[PDB]
Design a protein around this ligand. Structure first.
Ligand SMILES: N[C@@H]1[C@@H](O)[C@H](O)[C@@H](CO)O[C@H]1O
Ligand SMILES: [Cl-]
Lengths: 215, 221
């Protein structure tokens, strides 16, 4: 099999920047049958370049490809905020038509602090023996954020899970949910539910909290 | 317009089988090599198999040789993948994918998720994330739905049957310790609307044939 190695693994650049994505083949790729795909999170890949240097239908001029032999590149000449994706190269000269491992391109923007919201468990859920407490960090950049849960002032470990949205296609921010899960019993053992957020955009960490049973 | 529509995926027992179908239109399918490509959760794309325009030549990744068969029906403009002796390593979204020489950006299907598990389908419980003083500043409140304890993926969530679009964030599902998924969908809206406007999350879990509409009621003092 021809092995394709992509570099860099991750790339973070601002709108207007030139982005370069490399694809190296373990042996020469005949006919320059080398393709590039853009994949957004959770979406179908779209073919962007075929035959090493040809744009697919609907692909704007800022995307171009070049190369031959064992070295190929995909260029975005002038980045736009909608250009975040994982980009994959593929060779299709001789089966198996293998893919590289992808380059994740993030669009860089100026620092943006999260807005923080907290949601107690619903009475509906409480009826059934479990309490989920949700903390929302909305519209922030960069992606790195620390969320610490504290119940009557003790910080939690191992009972929370986080998920992050894909970047916003216009303003390049992320949002994050953190869910703390307690038994309905253990929920009742305590009073103060707090989410403490540390982020580069905040001058000091922000805490959002409620007391179990309030408006 | 180009369309490639996969079907036949879903949940399947380890050791079981599935038949994937892909119906193609909008370009001359019968003149192109076609392929299946898969993507395991959180992993990269992996080529699975391909087939000549007349079906007379085909290739497979070694991990599926002898148990997957690619075929086509040019009369029906369709591509197939017959998958047997399934294992956890086969869990992935499966895409039918045109040979890239076609030169069309939209030349792959939507994908069908294959989940190889002994577990049952299970529909979600949908709980309100109620707007309160703790989710409202400026003229905007956040509210949402917690879509909890379902299996397998995926679920879809809309708000107000699709009328409500901006400020929505449906988070990626997370797998709990239990082996069930959970997800939240939130939206930010004007605070003034909360008395007048109804906010309803529309949840669809096709694997279990579960549809839930949950009205999200505000908190006021
Ligand atoms: N072995 C190759 C395939 O893998 C390829 O995609 C197709 C079109 O090049 O033609 C075959 O001869
Ligand atoms: Cl591959």
């Amino acid at each position: 099999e021809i092995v394709l190695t992509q570099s860099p693994g991750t790339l973070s650049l601002s709108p207007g920047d030139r982005a370069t994505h490399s694809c190296r083949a373990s042996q020469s790729v005949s006919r320059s049958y080398l393709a590039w795909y853009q994949q957004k999170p959770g979406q179908t890949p779209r073919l962007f370049i075929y035959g090493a240097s040809n744009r697919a239908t609907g692909i704007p001029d800022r995307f171009s490809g070049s190369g031959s032999g064992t070295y190929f590149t995909l260029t975005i000449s002038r980045l736009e905020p909608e250009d975040f994706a994982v980009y994959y190269c593929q060779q299709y000269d001789s089966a198996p038509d293998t893919f590289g491992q992808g380059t994740r391109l993030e669009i860089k923007r100026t620092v943006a602090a999260p807005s923080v919201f907290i949601f107690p468990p619903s009475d509906e859920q409480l009826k059934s023996g479990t309490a989920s407490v949700v903390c929302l960090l909305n519209n922030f950049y960069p992606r790195e954020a620390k969320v610490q849960w504290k119940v009557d002032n003790a910080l939690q470990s191992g009972n929370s899970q986080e998920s992050v949205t894909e970047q916003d296609s216009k303003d390049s921010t992320y949002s994050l949910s953190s869910t703390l899960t307690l038994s309905k019993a253990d929920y009742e053992k305590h009073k103060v539910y707090a989410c403490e957020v540390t982020h580069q955009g905040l001058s000091s960490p922000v805490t959002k909290s409620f007391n179990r049973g309030e408006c | 317009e180009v369309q490639l529509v996969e079907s036949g995926g879903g949940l399947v027992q380890p050791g079981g089988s599935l038949r994937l179908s892909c119906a193609v239109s909008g370009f001359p399918f019968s003149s192109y090599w076609m392929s299946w490509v898969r993507q395991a959760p959180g992993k990269g794309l992996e080529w699975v198999a391909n087939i000549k325009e007349d079906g007379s030549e085909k290739y497979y990744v070694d991990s599926v040789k002898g148990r997957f068969t690619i075929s086509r029906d040019n009369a029906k403009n369709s591509l197939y993948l017959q998958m047997n002796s399934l294992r956890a390593e086969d869990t992935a979204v499966y895409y039918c994918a045109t040979d890239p020489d076609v030169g069309l950006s939209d030349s792959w299907g939507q994908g069908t998720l294959v989940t190889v598990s002994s577990a049952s389908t299970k529909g979600p419980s949908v709980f309100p994330l109620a707007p309160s003083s703790k989710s409202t500043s400026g003229g905007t409140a956040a509210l949402g739905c917690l879509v909890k304890d379902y299996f397998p993926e995926p679920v879809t969530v809309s708000w107000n049957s699709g009328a409500l679009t901006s400020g929505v964030h449906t988070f990626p599902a997370v797998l709990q310790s239990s082996g069930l998924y959970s997800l939240s969908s939130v939206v930010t809206v004007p605070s003034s609307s909360l008395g007048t406007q109804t906010y309803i999350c529309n949840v669809n879990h096709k694997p279990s044939n579960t549809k839930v509409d949950k009205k999200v009621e505000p908190k006021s003092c």
